Each structure stands twice: as structure tokens, then as C-alpha cells.
Design a protein around this ligand. Structure first.
Ligand SMILES: *[C@@H]1O[C@H](CO[C@@H]2O[C@@H](C)[C@@H](O)[C@@H](O)[C@@H]2O)[C@@H](O[C@@H]2O[C@H](CO)[C@@H](O[C@@H]3O[C@H](CO[C@H]4O[C@H](CO)[C@@H](O)[C@H](O)[C@@H]4O[C@@H]4O[C@H](CO)[C@@H](O[C@@H]5O[C@H](CO[C@]6(C(=O)O)C[C@H](O)[C@@H](NC(C)=O)[C@H]([C@H](O)[C@H](O)CO)O6)[C@H](O)[C@H](O)[C@H]5O)[C@H](O)[C@H]4NC(C)=O)[C@@H](O)[C@H](O[C@H]4O[C@H](CO)[C@@H](O)[C@H](O)[C@@H]4O[C@@H]4O[C@H](CO)[C@@H](O)[C@H](O)[C@H]4NC(C)=O)[C@@H]3O)[C@H](O)[C@H]2NC(C)=O)[C@H](O)[C@H]1NC(C)=O
Ligand SMILES: *[C@@H]1O[C@H](CO[C@@H]2O[C@@H](C)[C@@H](O)[C@@H](O)[C@@H]2O)[C@@H](O[C@@H]2O[C@H](CO)[C@@H](O[C@@H]3O[C@H](CO[C@H]4O[C@H](CO)[C@@H](O)[C@H](O)[C@@H]4O[C@@H]4O[C@H](CO)[C@@H](O[C@@H]5O[C@H](CO)[C@H](O)[C@H](O)[C@H]5O)[C@H](O)[C@H]4NC(C)=O)[C@@H](O)[C@H](O[C@H]4O[C@H](CO)[C@@H](O)[C@H](O)[C@@H]4O[C@@H]4O[C@H](CO)[C@@H](O[C@@H]5O[C@H](CO)[C@H](O)[C@H](O)[C@H]5O)[C@H](O)[C@H]4NC(C)=O)[C@@H]3O)[C@H](O)[C@H]2NC(C)=O)[C@H](O)[C@H]1NC(C)=O
Ligand SMILES: [Cl-]
Ligand SMILES: [Cl-]
Lengths: 207, 209
């Protein structure tokens, strides 16, 4: 059987209101050795409050058994080390994967907004750009707002690694050229641990 | 509990540059000890070909074999959407496995390319960032570079193609330059290679003011 350990969503670890969960996925458990017994540890110290989900048989030969652990916000942002430990008869020794927040100094993202280029202004819709660079680790979340209302016609590139070991990304919001003319304000907002209040906003409006 | 086949396409740049070699790799894994021999047959649009380079078997750390076979593809063949089928045979299988690969089947779309300068707030920095927006292209195979005067700049990074809401793709490319070098009106150039541009190449330039 094969063990895969997953980290929480970036907004879940950043907002005091939400619930971050580290997940531990067991795959390839036989119908003759079906017993999977987990053992979680936070800095090697065993915890018992994991919520093992209903065992679901995957559509092939085998089941997959998933254990959800809520993590403390302080702990994950102090990159404590979460050890999943799945035991099965079919295994030689118990398998032990280990996840944590990315090690090293957290670095503040720089957030810049870029307005559509003139060549684009000839088209029906235009492209509002948000550059976010110099941040570490790569766990981040980017959204678009206008008139304090969620804009949702955007796409964001993945974090790309840069020469200093920090990350950058761009987010592109697509709007009707008409709407951007008449100088509406559109806002790019970024949530990252290194920010004060784990949030910054920047904005952009027709000059 | 049987061998698994995986068939990979050529790298984007390799399909787009006349100097590179675009190749199709067919990888067999989970080959057992008692049934280790793997036979490859390769078909280009249904016609069998006999110049793949099949590598020797190679035992992996998990006590199974991995056997691969590499077929070079012609640049024009791949771009015209020929279909490359790898037929793997192995005594542990009920009948041969067949996988087929080709270019992406959707309607080609010319990339539109827009250059963006630094933002005013960025200028207060020691190093500023020149931005290329390549959008609306399809398929996602694309290559992007930067050029100054006539030499290829080498402090750029490019995002992967991102799937847009119309089923085409976009990416951005970022180049980091000295603020004082963008100052003084130097020209920088963003070159894009894509199957559906004329001569498969377009170039856009960025200057101060
Ligand atoms: C049999 O079968 C099985 C199964 O399968 C299936 O089925 C079948 C029938 C078919 O179809 C298939 O195909 C399918 O799939 C199988 O199994 C398998 O296995 C494998 C192995 O073998 C594996 O693999 C792996 O994977 C990984 C990942 O994955 C991912 O992705 C995918 C896609 O496709 C998917 O599917 C998966 O699942 C995943 O995902 C993920 O997950 C996770 C967990 O869970 C998560 O997390 C989480 O999340 C959550 C969320 O939430 C929620 C939301 O959403 O929000 C909540 C809410 O409330 C709700 N909502 C509502 C409205 O309701 C929701 C709900 O619930 C629902 O969902 C809705 O519907 O929810 C939260 O947030 C938490 O907190 C968290 O935690 C996530 O999200 C997801 N995501 C996504 C995107 O999706 C990967 O990664 C891997 O890779 C790795 O590994 C390898 C080796 O191993 C290598 O090669 C690579 O490279 C990698 O590596 C790595 O790397 C890194 C860096 O680089 C490092 O770090 C490390 O260390 C490394 N490692 C090593 C080297 O080792 C792989 O790929 C898979 O997964 C499986 N699958 C499954 C499905 O499970 C089996 O196998 C078979 N058998 C045979 C074939 O024989
Ligand atoms: C044992 O072992 C072995 C080995 O391994 C090793 O060892 C171990 C022990 C450890 O250590 C580890 O770590 C190592 O590695 C194994 O094997 C394995 O197996 C697995 C399975 O099981 C596999 O997996 C797969 O994968 C893939 C990918 O892969 C890649 O990547 C990775 C990372 O991640 C790596 O690892 C690999 O290698 C690969 O890589 C690649 O490769 C290639 C070749 O070479 C390359 O390319 C090339 O290159 C060259 C240079 O060199 C030149 O350039 C040329 O030109 C070319 O050709 C590349 O680059 C690379 N990459 C990188 C590195 O990055 C994936 O894909 C898969 O997945 C898939 O499948 C699955 C199934 O199974 C599923 O689930 C998923 O989902 C997927 O799916 C797919 O998908 C797609 C999309 O999505 C599709 O398509 C589609 O279709 C549709 C229809 O409707 C539509 O049309 C659309 O549009 C489209 O798109 C397809 O179809 C699908 N498929 C299916 C479903 O089927 C997987 O994941 C792996 O790979 C392996 N590995 C190796 C190494 O081999 C075994 O297993 C063991 N055993 C036991 C028992 O355990
Ligand atoms: Cl807490
Ligand atoms: Cl050729």
C-alpha cells in the first residue's frame, strides 16, 4: 500500500476563521489485508483527533482510506512537522510520510498592477494584469474585486520559481473594454503569510 | 498486476525549432521477472515504421522492469497531426496494449502578444520587470524568449500555459533588468514561437515612453 500526505489550502491556513486540514491518503489496500491503522504525530508527539473517513473501495481492485487531521494555525505557520503513519499487514515496516510548511524565511510579496497595453485596447475585451513577486513560500491566494464585489472572470498562473528562490505569478482579469473605459476601479487582492494582516490589496483604474 | 504503458509527446521547443529533435517516448513499467520481454511496434498513421531506438530493460528500485522506446518524429509530420501508435506486447498481458498520440486536436489559434512595462510603483526599485502577455493561443505548445539589440536576454522566466475560459491558453513572461537600463530608452523584444503564427514566429518590442 502507498501513502500520500497533502497540505491545507492556502486561505485555510491564513484566515483565523477557517479550518486547515492535512490529509493522508492510503491507496492500494488489498481485500485480503484490508486493515489500515493510522498514527499521527505533530513534531513526533502522537495525536488522536484525526477523523478517518468512511472507507471507500476504489473502482479497481483496491480501497483507498483517507485520514483528515485539523492543524492549528500557529503550528502550520511555524512549520511544525506532521507525520502520518499507516500500518497494514501487507507492508514490511509501517510507512511514514512527513509534510510541513516550506522551510526558510517568509518573504513579503510585492504586488503591482498593470493596465492593458494599447494594442489590446483595439479589441472587444481587455486584460487587467496583476504581478505578484518575491514571495516565499509559494502558498498564496489571489482574487479580483470591483466596487467591493467579487469579480470572477480571472485566471492566475501557478507560482513560478525565480532566481533568488522566491516565487512570482501573474493574474489576469478579463473585462469588456467598454467597462474599463469609464474608469471603474478594479482591485487585485493577495493573501500571503508574510503580509501584515495576511492580506494586501492594490488597484488600477483608467488614466 | 500487469505492465502499464505511457506515451509522451515531444517537448514544446523541440517541435518548434528546426535545430531540435522532437521525439515520442513510449514507456512500459511494471514488467515482471517471469515475463520480462517487451516487444514494441510503431505505426505512423497506421503504417509500421522500423527505426525507433528501443532501450534495454532496466530494473527499478521497486523490483520491476522499465523498458522504453523512442521514435523520432518529423517536425512537419507532428505538426500536421499525424498519429503515433505504440503497440507493446508482453507475455503477462491478455493481448497487446496500444496507445496513440498526436498533436492537440482542437482548432489552432494565433497567439496575440502584448508587452507591458513596469508599474510606476515598481520604478522606485533597483530592478524592474518587463512583462510579456501571450494570450489566446492554441494548442499550448509555445516557446517565448527575450532579446536586446540583437542578443538573447537571459534573465527572463516564463509561466506555464494557463487554460483560459474560452479553451485557448495564455502565459506571461517576465524579464528583470536594471532600472537605469530601462531608463535611457533601450529597446527590449519579446519573441514568440507558435505553430499558428506566420513563419511560426512573431516579435514585439518594449521601449521607455
Ligand atoms: C486504482 O485506482 C486508484 C484511484 O484512481 C482513481 O479511480 C480510478 C478508477 C481511475 O479513474 C484513476 O485514474 C483515478 O484517479 C489509484 O490511486 C492513485 O494512486 C496514485 C499512485 O499510484 C496516486 O498518485 C499520486 O497523486 C498525487 C496527487 O494526486 C492529486 O491529483 C489527482 C488529479 O487526477 C486527484 O485524483 C488526487 O485525488 C489528488 O488530488 C488532491 O488530493 C488531496 C487529498 O485529499 C487534496 O487535498 C485536500 O483537499 C481538501 C479539499 O476540500 C474540499 C474542497 O475541495 O475544498 C472541501 C469542501 O467542503 C467540499 N466541497 C463541496 C462543494 O462539497 C469538497 C468535497 O469533499 C469534494 O471533493 C467535492 O466533490 O472538498 C482540503 O483542502 C484539505 O485540507 C486538503 O488536504 C487536494 O485538494 C487534491 N487536489 C486536486 C488538484 O485534486 C501526486 O502528487 C503524486 O505525485 C507524486 O508522487 C509520484 C510518486 O509517488 C511522483 O512521480 C511525483 O513526481 C510526485 O512526487 C512528489 O513530488 C513532490 C515535489 O516534487 C515531493 O514533495 C514528494 O515527496 C514527491 N513524492 C515522491 C517523489 O515519492 C502521484 O501522482 C493517485 O493520487 C491515486 N488516485 C486517487 C484518486 O486517489 C490506484 O493506484 C489504482 N491502482 C492501480 C493503478 O494499480
Ligand atoms: C515501480 O517504479 C516505476 C518507476 O518509477 C521510479 O522508481 C520508483 C521506485 C520511484 O522511485 C519513482 O519515484 C520513480 O519515478 C513506476 O513507474 C511509474 O509508474 C507510474 C504509474 O504507476 C507513472 O505515472 C504516470 O506518469 C505520467 C507522467 O509521468 C512523467 O512525469 C513524472 C513526474 O511526475 C515522471 O516520474 C515520469 O518519468 C514522466 O516523466 C516524463 O517522461 C517523459 C519520457 O521520458 C518525458 O518526455 C520526453 O523527454 C525526453 C527527455 O528525457 C525528450 O525531450 C522527448 O522529446 C520526450 O518525449 C517528460 O519530460 C517527463 N516529464 C517530467 C520528467 O516531468 C502521468 O501522465 C500519468 O498519469 C496519467 O495516467 C494515469 C493512469 O495511470 C491517470 O490516473 C492520470 O490522470 C494521467 O492520466 C493521463 O492524463 C492525460 C491528460 O490528463 C490523458 O490524455 C488525455 O486524454 C483525454 C481523452 O478523453 C483528452 O483527449 C485529453 O485532452 C488528453 O490530455 C492520458 O490519456 C491519461 N492516461 C491515462 C488515464 O491512463 C501517470 O501519473 C510514472 O510515470 C512511472 N515512472 C517512471 C519513472 O517511469 C512503477 O509504477 C512502480 N511500480 C510499482 C508497483 O510501484
Ligand atoms: Cl488554533
Ligand atoms: Cl523533418
Amino acid at each position: 500500500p502507498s501513502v500520500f500526505l497533502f497540505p491545507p489550502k492556502p486561505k485555510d491556513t491564513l484566515m483565523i476563521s477557517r479550518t486547515p486540514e492535512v490529509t493522508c491518503v492510503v491507496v492500494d489496500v488489498s481485500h485480503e489485508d484490508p486493515e489500515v491503522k493510522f498514527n499521527w504525530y505533530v513534531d513526533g508527539v502522537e495525536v488522536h483527533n484525526a477523523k478517518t473517513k468512511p472507507r471507500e473501495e476504489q473502482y479497481n481492485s483496491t480501497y483507498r482510506v483517507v485520514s483528515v487531521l485539523t492543524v492549528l494555525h500557529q503550528d502550520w505557520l511555524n512549520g511544525k512537522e506532521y507525520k502520518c503513519k499507516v500500518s497494514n499487514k501487507a507492508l514490511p515496516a509501517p510507512i511514514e510520510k512527513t509534510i510541513s510548511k516550506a522551510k526558510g524565511q517568509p518573504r513579503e510579496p510585492q504586488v503591482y498592477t498593470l493596465p492593458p497595453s494599447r494594442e489590446e485596447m483595439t479589441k472587444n475585451q481587455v486584460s487587467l494584469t496583476c504581478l505578484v513577486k518575491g514571495f516565499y513560500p509559494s502558498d498564496i491566494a489571489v482574487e479580483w474585486e470591483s466596487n467591493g464585489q467579487p469579480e470572477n472572470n480571472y485566471k492566475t498562473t501557478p507560482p513560478v520559481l525565480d532566481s533568488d528562490g522566491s516565487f512570482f505569478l501573474y493574474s489576469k482579469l478579463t473585462v469588456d473594454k467598454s467597462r474599463w473605459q469609464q474608469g471603474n476601479v478594479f482591485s487585485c487582492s493577495v493573501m500571503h503569510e508574510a503580509l501584515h494582516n495576511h492580506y494586501t490589496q492594490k488597484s488600477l483604474s483608467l488614466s
